[PDB]
Design a protein around this ligand. Structure first.
Ligand SMILES: CCCCCCCCCCCCCCCCCC(=O)OC[C@H](COP(=O)([O-])OCC[N+](C)(C)C)OC(=O)CCCCCCCCCCCCCCCCC
Ligand SMILES: CCCCCCCCCCCCCCCCCC(=O)OC[C@H](COP(=O)([O-])OCC[N+](C)(C)C)OC(=O)CCCCCCCCCCCCCCCCC
Ligand SMILES: CCCCCCCCCCCCCCCCCC(=O)OC[C@H](COP(=O)(O)OCCN)OC(=O)CCCCCCCCCCCCCCCCC
Ligand SMILES: CCCCCCCCCCCCCC(=O)SCCNC(=O)CCNC(=O)[C@@H](O)C(C)(C)COP(=O)(O)O
Ligand code: SF4
Lengths: 42, 110, 114, 98, 156, 82
């Protein structure tokens, strides 16, 4: 029985799975000398 | 009472040295600084592995909490039961360690 | 007169690449003013983008404007990735430079240059 | 009864009403739950020491250990919610309204 | 007066403590880094003067610019100098830090680190020897010894 | 996206937020290049304002043929139902 309150409720997924909706970037700068841009995954 | 005096003296000396370290160079009038990190502005990435080693610490620390009355427990007159349950608690800590091992829970912080 | 192209066969594909590059710079400018915490406005940075595009608007060679789009994408890639500092972004705005004499008379007054 | 028991019960009810009135964070709910557990530890401990009931002295340690294990489980649930939405906000846990 | 004597003794105390515990942040830019490492090596041993080996930049007292400052690293030098707490000092080691040096007429080289940071000691050489750099650090200590902070404060 | 009239009203609202177009001469059939006298990049930032308001990516091969607000509202009417 949809009312005005329950007028935006969509049904759940058929497999009950909702979509989940990155990795670290470190700039080891000059602070010899060298700059490094790391893309780390942990 | 002597312990409360000692804790208060240690806390008072620590707070005194912290106040001195935070307000002795404030008397200097050096300059006002403007000054406009490896990560640029990125959000702190969660790592599951640090949380796993922290929970593994907590669980083995609860097993340690069970193990702590053993020097008093050895004084009992039910020594066969005491020895069986002592070896059983250390064995269950070992089995928790082995299950954490063999299911790759101790990996990349091994 | 028959030369090897770079990306564009003629000026239409070339102007398309120029147009996509202007779109990408226009989208990037507010993020640049935010994360570098520049002291300019988004209108002012977009006017500098428009100035840098309209400076090269007299070019009629497809290979030259291909290389201009290549170098503009290199500038944008060095700006999105934080490879420039604030200094490299603000070198487009010649702020510490005194205004040059533009007419004949003040160039006569200050020195020998034409 | 004893005057300290009033304060330990009142602390349990304060941590109860904190646990029964969320603001945003699931971690604040877990902290209120562990404040409840701490007050239970203190109250059980003061009774068992007060009564000289010797064999129940192992009781609060057990009351610690299990519940701290429970706390560990709760932290893992928070992390899984934090691995879904980025935060631990309880208003992100509303998919089961429909 | 009495206050003049007290600020004289206190300036002597704080200048003794600052010069006798100098902590360097060394920019290992170019060949002068090797000779700084020889000034830290066991023949010369900066640490016997209280000059520690590789303090972190947020707690260092002097910034030793040892090598060529290129244009691509001039804001990095300026940023590290801005992050140093006061009293900070800057020693310019060798000819490229001093005036550009062998790369003075280059398109890519800052002609002396004094265009970017204020410089207290200029140590000349290509590279200046580790004994010459240690001489420059002792001259910096003598410059700190004759500072008159509290005396000028008492006269202002 | 609902009614074509609201889409035309919102196109005109976007183009009167645009500060180089004089709102007096601005009509729905007004040409950007020869009537209002705009640069190509002015039309490009117009189309990106349309992308900001209408919320979909307009490609380049069909944004170059949007030379009046009527062409813009017809293009958005093509990319949706109405
Ligand atoms: C127990 C472990 C050791 C404890 C700490 C060491 C003991 C000594 C602590 C006091 C040291 C001396 C005073 C602080 C340092 C002064 C240096 C300084 O910057 O002076 C200029 C400063 C500021 O003078 P200023 O006006 O020239 O400021 C310089 C900055 N400009 C010009 C840009 C504005 O002087 C003072 O702060 C004077 C404050 C009183 C001095 C001490 C009074 C007697 C204390 C006993
Ligand atoms: C798996 C469990 C392994 C250990 C089992 C108990 C070993 C032991 O020493 O028990 C004697 C102990 C103690 O026996 P006891 O002989 O020392 O008893 C004398 C009585 N007191 C201690 C009061 C002086 O335990 C028991 O007899 C009963 C408790 C354990 C019963 C078995 C549990 C099985 C669980 C399966 C799930
Ligand atoms: C009735 C039983 C309780 C009696 C004591 C009440 C104490 C005062 C709290 C009253 C409610 C105030 C309030 O704003 O409650 C909402 C707040 C959580 O809401 P929040 O997300 O912060 O803000 C949006 C507003 N709904 O809720 C809270 O922050 C509540 C936190 C409660 C902690 C209890 C502290 C001790 C109180 C006295 C003993 C009981
Ligand atoms: C912060 C500051 C940001 C600085 C950004 C620097 C980026 C500079 C990128 C420069 C790339 C170019 O200049 S490519 C332009 C070259 N194009 C040409 O020579 C062809 C002529 N082009 C034009 O007339 C262009 O206006 C158009 C838009 C393609 C067509 O306009 P006309 O038609 O009306
Ligand atoms: S002053 Fe000369 S020797 Fe020294 S670092 Fe520079 S190039 Fe090398």
């Amino acid at each position: 029985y949809p009312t005005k309150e329950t007028a935006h409720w969509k049904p759940p997924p058929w497999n009950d799975v909702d979509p989940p909706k990155s990795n670290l970037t470190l700039n080891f700068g000059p602070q010899g000398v060298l700059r490094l841009v790391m893309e780390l995954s942990g | 009472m002597n312990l409360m005096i000692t804790l208060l003296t240690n806390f008072t000396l620590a707070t005194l040295l912290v106040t001195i370290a935070f307000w002795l160079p404030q008397l200097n009038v050096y300059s006002e600084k403007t000054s406009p990190d490896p990560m640029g502005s990125a959000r702190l990435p969660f790592s599951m592995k640090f949380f796993l080693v922290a929970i593994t610490f907590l669980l083995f620390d609860l097993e340690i909490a069970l193990l702590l009355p053993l020097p008093w427990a050895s004084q009992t007159t039910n020594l066969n039961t005491m020895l069986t349950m002592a070896l059983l608690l250390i064995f269950l800590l070992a089995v928790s360690l082995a299950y954490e091992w063999t299911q790759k829970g101790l990996e990349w912080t091994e | 007169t028959s030369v090897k192209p770079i990306f564009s066969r003629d000026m239409n594909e070339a102007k398309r690449r120029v147009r996509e590059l202007y779109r990408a710079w226009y989208r990037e400018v507010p993020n640049t003013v935010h994360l570098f915490q520049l002291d300019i406005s988004v209108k002012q940075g977009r006017d500098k983008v428009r100035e840098m595009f309209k400076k090269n608007a007299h070019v009629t060679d497809p290979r030259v404007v291909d290389l201009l789009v290549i170098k503009g994408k290199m500038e944008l890639e060095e700006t999105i990735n934080v490879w420039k500092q604030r200094t490299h972004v603000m070198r487009f705005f010649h702020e510490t430079e005194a205004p040059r004499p533009k007419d004949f008379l003040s160039k006569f007054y200050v020195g020998h240059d034409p | 009864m004893s005057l300290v028991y009033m304060n330990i019960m009142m602390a349990f009810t304060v941590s109860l009403t904190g646990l029964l009135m969320y603001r945003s964070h699931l971690m604040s709910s877990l902290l209120c739950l562990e404040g409840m557990m701490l007050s239970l530890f203190i109250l059980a401990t003061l009774m068992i020491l007060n009564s000289h009931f010797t064999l129940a002295s192992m009781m609060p340690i057990i009351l610690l250990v299990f519940a701290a294990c429970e706390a560990a489980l709760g932290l893992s649930l928070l992390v899984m919610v934090s691995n879904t939405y980025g935060t631990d906000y309880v208003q992100n846990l509303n998919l089961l309204q429909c | 007066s009495r206050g003049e004597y007290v600020v004289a003794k206190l300036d002597d105390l704080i200048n003794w403590a600052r010069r006798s515990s100098l902590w360097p942040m060394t920019f290992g830019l170019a060949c002068c880094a090797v000779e700084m490492m020889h000034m830290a090596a066991p023949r010369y041993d900066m640490d016997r003067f209280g000059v520690v080996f590789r303090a972190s930049p947020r707690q260092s007292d002097v910034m030793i610019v040892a090598g060529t400052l290129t244009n691509k690293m001039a804001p990095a030098l300026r940023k590290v100098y801005d992050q140093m707490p006061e009293p900070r000092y800057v020693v310019s080691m060798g000819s490229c830090a001093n005036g550009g040096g062998y790369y003075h007429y280059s398109y890519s080289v800052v002609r002396g680190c004094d265009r970017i940071v204020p410089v207290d000691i200029y140590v000349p050489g290509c590279p200046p020897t580790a004994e010459a750099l240690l001489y420059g650090i002792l001259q910096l200590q003598k410059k700190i010894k004759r500072e008159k902070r509290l005396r000028i404060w008492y006269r202002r | 996206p609902l009614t074509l009239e609201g889409i035309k009203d919102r196109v005109l609202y976007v183009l009167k937020l645009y500060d180089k177009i004089d709102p007096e001469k601005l009509s729905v059939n007004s040409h950007f290049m020869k009537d209002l006298g705009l640069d190509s990049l002015d039309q490009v930032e117009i189309i990106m304002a349309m992308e900001d308001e209408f919320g979909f990516e307009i490609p380049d091969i069909d944004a170059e043929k949007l030379m009046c607000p009527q062409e813009i509202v017809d293009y958005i009417a093509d990319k949706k139902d109405v």
